[PDB]
Structures are given as C-alpha cells and as structure tokens.
Amino acid sequence: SPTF
Amino acid sequence: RMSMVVSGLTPEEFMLVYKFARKHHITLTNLITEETTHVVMKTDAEFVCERTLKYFLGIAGGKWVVSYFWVTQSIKERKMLNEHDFEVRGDVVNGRNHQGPKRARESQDRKIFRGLEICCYGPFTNMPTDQLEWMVQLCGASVVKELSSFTLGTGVHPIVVVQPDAWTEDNGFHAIGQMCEAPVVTREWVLTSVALYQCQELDTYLIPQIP
Ligand SMILES: [Cl-]
Ligand code: NI
Numbered sequence: 001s002p003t004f
Numbered sequence: 005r006m007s008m009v010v011s012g013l014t015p016e017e018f019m020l021v022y023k024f025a026r027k028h029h030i031t032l033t034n035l036i037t038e039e040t041t042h043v044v045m046k047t048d049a050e051f052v053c054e055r056t057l058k059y060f061l062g063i064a065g066g067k068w069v070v071s072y073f074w075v076t077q078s079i080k081e082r083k084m085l086n087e088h089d090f091e092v093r094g095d096v097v098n099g100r101n102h103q104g105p106k107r108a109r110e111s112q113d114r115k116i117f118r119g120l121e122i123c124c125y126g127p128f129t130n131m132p133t134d135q136l137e138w139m140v141q142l143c144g145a146s147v148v149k150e151l152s153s154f155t156l157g158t159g160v161h162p163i164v165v166v167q168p169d170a171w172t173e174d175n176g177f178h179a180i181g182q183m184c185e186a187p188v189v190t191r192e193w194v195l196t197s198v199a200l201y202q203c204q205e206l207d208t209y210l211i212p213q214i215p
Pocket of ligand 1: 002003
C-alpha cells in the first residue's frame with residue numbers, strides 16, 4: 001500500500 | 005453486522021485476520037466503502053501505524069481504526085476484545101500520540117470541514133483524486149471540479165488543494181490565485197488535518213500565489  | 009478492511013499487513017497476517025473473521029462471523033473486504041465498519045492497521049509496540057489511504061478514509065468515516073493487535077489478542081484469548089481498548093493513537097508522521105480516530109469517531113456532529121468548498125486541483129500520486137475528494141466529502145466539505153465552479157458569494161469558504169510534486173509545470177501552481185479567489189494549499193493540509201481530525205489552518209500550507 002502506499003504511505004503518506 | 006461488522007465489516008472490515010486491513011492495511012499494512014502480510015499474507016500470514018491477513019490469513020490471521022481471516023481466521024478472526026471466519027470465527028466471529030465478520031465480513032472482510034479488499035476495499036473500504038460507506039459500509040466498512042473497521043480498519044485494521046499494522047502498528048508498532050503501542051499503536052502507531054503508518055499513513056495510508058485506508059488509514060485516512062478510516063478516520064474520515066469515523067470508522068473503528070484498530071491496530072492488528074486487536075486481532076492476534078482476540079485470537080489469543082479466544083474471543084472478541086474491545087475495539088475500545090485497541091485504537092491507533094498516532095502515526096510516524098503526525099505524532100506517536102495524537103488520538104486521531106478518537107476525536108473522529110465521536111465528532112460526527114461537527115465535521116472538521118463544515119462549510120468548506122474544496123477543490124483538488126491538478127494531478128496527484130499514490131492517491132486517486134476521487135478518493136481525496138471522497139475524503140473531504142466525508143468530513144463535510146463539498147467538492148468542486150473546476151476552479152471556476154466555486155460558489156461565489158460571501159456565503160461560503162473555498163480552498164484549492166494541490167500537491168506540487170506531481171507536476172512538470174512552471175506556469176503551473178504558483179498561478180492558481182490568478183484564476184480565482186481562494187486560498188491555495190498542499191494536500192498535506194488535508195491529510196494532517198484528517199489525521200488529527202483537527203482542522204489545521206493554512207499558514208503553514210499556503211502556496212505562494214503570484215499576484
Ligand atoms: Cl504498503
Ligand atoms: Ni470566514
């Protein structure tokens with residue numbers, strides 16, 4: 001999953 | 005009933021949340037929606053996750069945002085422990101300890117974006133625009149597609165959200181303030197706001213607009  | 009998604013996991017971890025679900029008659033999906041009631045997060049020692057889309061849409065929906073350990077313990081003690089006692093406090097970016105989802109779960113009578121007209125402008129990354137838009141709609145902003153669709157009047161309060169990284173452009177994003185009359189800020193404004201469920205304000209996020 002991408003992260004922020 | 006209940007309905008779940010997970011974030012930050014691995015097959016074996018996942019398989020384990022499945023075990024949970026199967027046992028407990030809980031629904032488990034790939035994709036967060038209106039109806040999803042829980043969001044299980046990878047966290048460290050004490051309930052700090054990383055910041056992912058599901059993370060935010062989590063809080064935005066005032067969903068139950070709980071760290072993986074809810075699961076492995078509820079398995080270990082062979083029953084369902086209190087989401088209440090397992091929530092995710094914080095995250096690597098926004099502070100180990102900021103009560104995000106807490107605020108949010110309970111603040112459903114007053115979304116941080118009450119009376120805002122937000123517009124996500126130009127291209128973003130790792131995050132489909134419509135999902136960002138979904139996010140702010142969830143906190144009771146209301147979305148605008150093009151800058152010149154902004155409800156004029158003194159009635160309401162508009163904001164343009166961009167994320168400068170996804171650009172190839174020099175006449176680009178220093179120049180929005182020409183094409184209209186709104187504050188301009190980075191997507192970080194929204195995420196940090198949503199993380200904390202504390203409506204940040206914009207000094208620190210403003211993008212310098214050419215007059
Ligand atoms: Cl990931
Ligand atoms: Ni005002």
